[PDB]
Amino acid sequence: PQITLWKRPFVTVKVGGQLKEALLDTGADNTIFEDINLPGRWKPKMVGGIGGFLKVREYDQVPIEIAGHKVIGTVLVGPTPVNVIGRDTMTQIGATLNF
Amino acid sequence: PQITLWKRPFVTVKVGGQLKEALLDTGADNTIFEDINLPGRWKPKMVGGIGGFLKVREYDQVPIEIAGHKVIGTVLVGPTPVNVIGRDTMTQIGATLNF
Ligand SMILES: CC(C)CN(C[C@@H](O)[C@H](Cc1ccccc1)NC(=O)O[C@H]1CO[C@H]2OCC(F)(F)[C@H]21)S(=O)(=O)c1ccc(N)cc1
Ligand SMILES: [Cl-]
Numbered sequence: 046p047q048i049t050l051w052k053r054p055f056v057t058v059k060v061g062g063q064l065k066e067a068l069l070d071t072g073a074d075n076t077i078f079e080d081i082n083l084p085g086r087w088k089p090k091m092v093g094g095i096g097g098f099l100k101v102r103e104y105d106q107v108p109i110e111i112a113g114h115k116v117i118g119t120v121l122v123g124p125t126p127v128n129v130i131g132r133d134t135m136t137q138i139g140a141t142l143n144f
Numbered sequence: 145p146q147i148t149l150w151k152r153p154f155v156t157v158k159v160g161g162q163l164k165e166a167l168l169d170t171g172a173d174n175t176i177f178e179d180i181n182l183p184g185r186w187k188p189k190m191v192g193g194i195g196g197f198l199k200v201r202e203y204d205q206v207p208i209e210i211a212g213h214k215v216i217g218t219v220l221v222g223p224t225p226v227n228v229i230g231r232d233t234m235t236q237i238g239a240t241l242n243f
Protein backbone atom coordinates (compact mmCIF):
# COMPACT_ATOMS: atom_id res chain seq x y z
CA PRO A 46 0.00 0.00 0.00
CA GLN A 47 0.84 3.78 -0.03
CA ILE A 48 -0.21 5.70 3.11
CA THR A 49 -0.10 9.29 4.23
CA LEU A 50 0.85 10.23 7.81
CA TRP A 51 -2.22 12.02 9.14
CA LYS A 52 -2.78 9.10 11.54
CA ARG A 53 -0.22 6.88 13.28
CA PRO A 54 0.87 4.23 10.64
CA PHE A 55 -0.30 1.06 12.32
CA VAL A 56 -0.31 -2.25 10.53
CA THR A 57 -1.66 -5.63 11.51
CA VAL A 58 0.97 -8.36 11.72
CA LYS A 59 1.25 -11.94 12.80
CA VAL A 60 4.48 -12.51 14.76
CA GLY A 61 5.33 -15.99 16.02
CA GLY A 62 1.69 -16.97 15.44
CA GLN A 63 0.24 -14.06 17.47
CA LEU A 64 -1.78 -11.22 16.04
CA LYS A 65 -0.57 -7.75 16.89
CA GLU A 66 -0.76 -4.15 15.70
CA ALA A 67 2.51 -2.29 15.29
CA LEU A 68 3.68 1.16 14.28
CA LEU A 69 5.63 1.38 10.84
CA ASP A 70 8.49 3.35 12.39
CA THR A 71 11.25 4.68 10.13
CA GLY A 72 12.99 6.08 13.25
CA ALA A 73 13.33 2.55 14.75
CA ASP A 74 16.39 0.51 13.80
CA ASN A 75 14.95 -2.59 15.42
CA THR A 76 11.35 -4.25 15.51
CA ILE A 77 10.07 -4.59 19.05
CA PHE A 78 6.96 -6.19 20.53
CA GLU A 79 5.57 -6.40 24.07
CA ASP A 80 3.57 -9.32 25.39
CA ILE A 81 4.44 -12.01 22.97
CA ASN A 82 5.72 -15.43 23.57
CA LEU A 83 8.40 -16.86 21.46
CA PRO A 84 10.19 -20.20 21.68
CA GLY A 85 13.88 -20.98 21.95
CA ARG A 86 16.96 -19.24 23.13
CA TRP A 87 17.34 -15.53 23.30
CA LYS A 88 20.14 -13.05 23.79
CA PRO A 89 19.72 -10.01 26.21
CA LYS A 90 19.73 -6.30 24.96
CA MET A 91 18.89 -2.66 25.48
CA VAL A 92 17.27 -0.01 23.17
CA GLY A 93 17.44 3.74 23.61
CA GLY A 94 14.94 6.42 22.88
CA ILE A 95 13.32 9.57 24.07
CA GLY A 96 13.71 9.47 27.74
CA GLY A 97 15.46 6.15 28.46
CA PHE A 98 16.98 2.66 27.50
CA LEU A 99 14.88 -0.46 27.88
CA LYS A 100 15.64 -3.99 28.48
CA VAL A 101 14.73 -6.49 25.79
CA ARG A 102 15.27 -10.12 24.75
CA GLU A 103 16.42 -10.79 21.23
CA TYR A 104 15.10 -13.59 19.07
CA ASP A 105 16.71 -14.26 15.69
CA GLN A 106 14.33 -16.70 14.12
CA VAL A 107 10.68 -15.61 14.49
CA PRO A 108 8.21 -15.38 11.59
CA ILE A 109 6.60 -12.02 10.79
CA GLU A 110 3.67 -11.80 8.34
CA ILE A 111 3.38 -8.19 7.27
CA ALA A 112 1.70 -6.45 4.34
CA GLY A 113 1.24 -9.69 2.42
CA HIS A 114 4.85 -10.79 2.91
CA LYS A 115 6.39 -13.29 5.21
CA VAL A 116 9.84 -12.57 6.23
CA ILE A 117 12.10 -14.02 8.85
CA GLY A 118 13.51 -11.30 11.05
CA THR A 119 15.05 -10.38 14.39
CA VAL A 120 12.53 -9.51 17.01
CA LEU A 121 13.15 -7.84 20.22
CA VAL A 122 10.68 -8.46 23.02
CA GLY A 123 10.24 -6.08 25.94
CA PRO A 124 7.84 -3.56 27.57
CA THR A 125 7.65 -0.95 24.80
CA PRO A 126 4.60 1.33 24.98
CA VAL A 127 3.63 0.45 21.46
CA ASN A 128 4.85 -2.29 19.21
CA VAL A 129 7.01 -0.96 16.33
CA ILE A 130 8.18 -2.32 13.02
CA GLY A 131 11.66 -1.03 12.45
CA ARG A 132 13.95 -0.69 9.46
CA ASP A 133 15.23 -4.25 9.85
CA THR A 134 11.85 -5.55 8.92
CA MET A 135 10.81 -2.69 6.54
CA THR A 136 13.87 -3.16 4.35
CA GLN A 137 12.89 -6.82 3.89
CA ILE A 138 9.61 -5.72 2.33
CA GLY A 139 11.16 -2.97 0.22
CA ALA A 140 9.48 -0.03 2.02
CA THR A 141 10.27 3.52 0.92
CA LEU A 142 9.64 7.08 2.12
CA ASN A 143 8.52 9.70 -0.36
CA PHE A 144 8.86 13.35 0.67
CA PRO B 145 12.94 12.42 -2.96
CA GLN B 146 12.14 8.68 -2.60
CA ILE B 147 14.42 6.83 -0.16
CA THR B 148 14.83 3.26 0.98
CA LEU B 149 15.47 2.37 4.64
CA TRP B 150 18.84 0.62 4.54
CA LYS B 151 20.32 3.55 6.43
CA ARG B 152 18.75 5.86 9.08
CA PRO B 153 16.65 8.41 7.09
CA PHE B 154 18.43 11.64 8.10
CA VAL B 155 17.62 14.90 6.38
CA THR B 156 19.25 18.30 6.64
CA VAL B 157 16.98 21.05 7.88
CA LYS B 158 17.14 24.65 8.89
CA VAL B 159 15.06 25.24 12.05
CA GLY B 160 14.80 28.77 13.47
CA GLY B 161 17.87 29.71 11.39
CA GLN B 162 20.01 26.83 12.67
CA LEU B 163 21.27 23.95 10.57
CA LYS B 164 20.54 20.51 11.93
CA GLU B 165 20.32 16.87 10.95
CA ALA B 166 17.09 15.06 11.91
CA LEU B 167 15.65 11.59 11.51
CA LEU B 168 12.39 11.32 9.23
CA ASP B 169 10.49 9.38 11.88
CA THR B 170 7.04 8.02 11.05
CA GLY B 171 6.80 6.68 14.62
CA ALA B 172 7.09 10.23 16.05
CA ASP B 173 3.92 12.26 16.45
CA ASN B 174 5.86 15.58 16.67
CA THR B 175 9.16 17.06 15.76
CA ILE B 176 11.84 17.43 18.46
CA PHE B 177 15.27 19.07 18.45
CA GLU B 178 18.02 19.32 21.04
CA ASP B 179 20.42 22.26 21.34
CA ILE B 180 18.52 24.94 19.47
CA ASN B 181 17.54 28.28 20.71
CA LEU B 182 14.31 29.75 19.71
CA PRO B 183 12.78 33.10 20.59
CA GLY B 184 9.57 33.94 22.36
CA ARG B 185 7.20 32.24 24.71
CA TRP B 186 6.95 28.50 25.10
CA LYS B 187 4.72 26.00 26.91
CA PRO B 188 5.80 23.09 28.97
CA LYS B 189 5.53 19.29 27.89
CA MET B 190 6.87 15.57 28.01
CA VAL B 191 7.07 12.86 25.37
CA GLY B 192 7.17 9.22 25.83
CA GLY B 193 9.03 6.39 24.14
CA ILE B 194 11.25 3.43 24.67
CA GLY B 195 12.54 4.21 28.07
CA GLY B 196 9.72 6.74 29.22
CA PHE B 197 9.44 10.57 29.12
CA LEU B 198 11.80 13.22 27.72
CA LYS B 199 11.02 16.68 29.10
CA VAL B 200 10.50 19.43 26.44
CA ARG B 201 9.52 23.11 25.68
CA GLU B 202 7.00 23.71 22.98
CA TYR B 203 7.26 26.48 20.45
CA ASP B 204 4.45 27.23 18.00
CA GLN B 205 6.04 29.55 15.47
CA VAL B 206 9.40 28.36 14.32
CA PRO B 207 10.30 28.10 10.68
CA ILE B 208 11.45 24.70 9.38
CA GLU B 209 13.08 24.43 5.90
CA ILE B 210 12.86 20.75 4.88
CA ALA B 211 13.14 18.98 1.50
CA GLY B 212 12.76 22.21 -0.46
CA HIS B 213 9.70 23.34 1.49
CA LYS B 214 9.23 25.89 4.20
CA VAL B 215 6.79 24.89 6.87
CA ILE B 216 5.72 26.72 9.87
CA GLY B 217 5.21 24.08 12.54
CA THR B 218 5.32 23.22 16.20
CA VAL B 219 8.57 22.43 17.53
CA LEU B 220 9.52 20.74 20.74
CA VAL B 221 12.95 21.43 22.23
CA GLY B 222 14.57 19.06 24.75
CA PRO B 223 17.40 16.56 25.25
CA THR B 224 16.47 13.93 22.66
CA PRO B 225 19.36 11.62 21.63
CA VAL B 226 18.70 12.41 17.98
CA ASN B 227 16.63 15.15 16.42
CA VAL B 228 13.43 13.80 14.76
CA ILE B 229 11.01 15.05 12.23
CA GLY B 230 7.61 13.79 13.18
CA ARG B 231 4.26 13.38 11.48
CA ASP B 232 3.26 16.97 12.32
CA THR B 233 5.95 18.22 9.96
CA MET B 234 5.88 15.32 7.47
CA THR B 235 2.17 15.77 6.75
CA GLN B 236 2.77 19.38 5.84
CA ILE B 237 5.17 18.25 3.07
CA GLY B 238 2.94 15.48 1.84
CA ALA B 239 5.21 12.58 2.84
CA THR B 240 4.03 9.02 2.26
CA LEU B 241 5.11 5.48 3.16
CA ASN B 242 5.12 2.79 0.49
CA PHE B 243 5.20 -0.84 1.64
C1 LIG C 1 9.08 4.62 20.11
C2 LIG C 1 8.21 5.53 19.23
C3 LIG C 1 6.78 5.03 19.40
C4 LIG C 1 8.42 6.97 19.65
N1 LIG C 1 9.75 7.57 19.34
C5 LIG C 1 10.22 7.63 17.93
C6 LIG C 1 11.11 6.49 17.47
O1 LIG C 1 11.17 6.53 16.03
C7 LIG C 1 12.51 6.63 18.05
C8 LIG C 1 13.37 7.78 17.47
C9 LIG C 1 14.73 7.78 18.16
C10 LIG C 1 15.87 7.42 17.42
C11 LIG C 1 17.15 7.40 17.95
C12 LIG C 1 17.27 7.68 19.31
C13 LIG C 1 16.16 8.00 20.10
C14 LIG C 1 14.87 8.03 19.51
N2 LIG C 1 13.28 5.38 17.80
C15 LIG C 1 13.42 4.42 18.75
O2 LIG C 1 13.08 4.43 19.89
O3 LIG C 1 14.14 3.33 18.25
C16 LIG C 1 14.66 2.32 19.14
C17 LIG C 1 14.27 0.99 18.51
O4 LIG C 1 15.26 0.82 17.49
C18 LIG C 1 16.49 1.45 17.88
O5 LIG C 1 16.78 2.47 16.88
C19 LIG C 1 16.79 3.80 17.38
C20 LIG C 1 16.86 3.64 18.88
F1 LIG C 1 16.23 4.65 19.53
F2 LIG C 1 18.03 3.51 19.45
C21 LIG C 1 16.21 2.27 19.12
S1 LIG C 1 10.29 8.67 20.31
O6 LIG C 1 11.64 8.93 19.91
O7 LIG C 1 10.08 8.17 21.65
C22 LIG C 1 9.40 10.07 20.10
C23 LIG C 1 8.17 10.26 20.76
C24 LIG C 1 7.34 11.41 20.56
C25 LIG C 1 7.76 12.37 19.65
N3 LIG C 1 7.01 13.48 19.42
C26 LIG C 1 8.96 12.20 18.98
C27 LIG C 1 9.75 11.06 19.18
CL1 LIG D 1 -3.53 8.24 15.14
Ligand SMILES: [Cl-]
Pocket residue numbers: 080124
Ligand atom coordinates in the same frame (compact mmCIF):
# COMPACT_ATOMS: atom_id res chain seq x y z
CL1 LIG E 1 3.98 -7.18 30.73
Ligand SMILES: [Cl-]
Pocket residue numbers: 150151152
Ligand atom coordinates in the same frame (compact mmCIF):
# COMPACT_ATOMS: atom_id res chain seq x y z
CL1 LIG F 1 22.63 4.65 9.31
Ligand SMILES: [Cl-]
Pocket residue numbers: 150151
Ligand atom coordinates in the same frame (compact mmCIF):
# COMPACT_ATOMS: atom_id res chain seq x y z
CL1 LIG G 1 21.37 3.99 1.17
Ligand code: NA
Pocket residue numbers: 076109116117118119120133134135137
Ligand atom coordinates in the same frame (compact mmCIF):
# COMPACT_ATOMS: atom_id res chain seq x y z
NA1 NA H 1 12.83 -8.34 10.76
Ligand SMILES: [Y+2]
Pocket residue numbers: 079080
Ligand atom coordinates in the same frame (compact mmCIF):
# COMPACT_ATOMS: atom_id res chain seq x y z
Y1 LIG I 1 2.39 -6.12 29.08
Ligand SMILES: [Y+2]
Pocket residue numbers: 178179
Ligand atom coordinates in the same frame (compact mmCIF):
# COMPACT_ATOMS: atom_id res chain seq x y z
Y1 LIG J 1 23.00 19.13 24.27
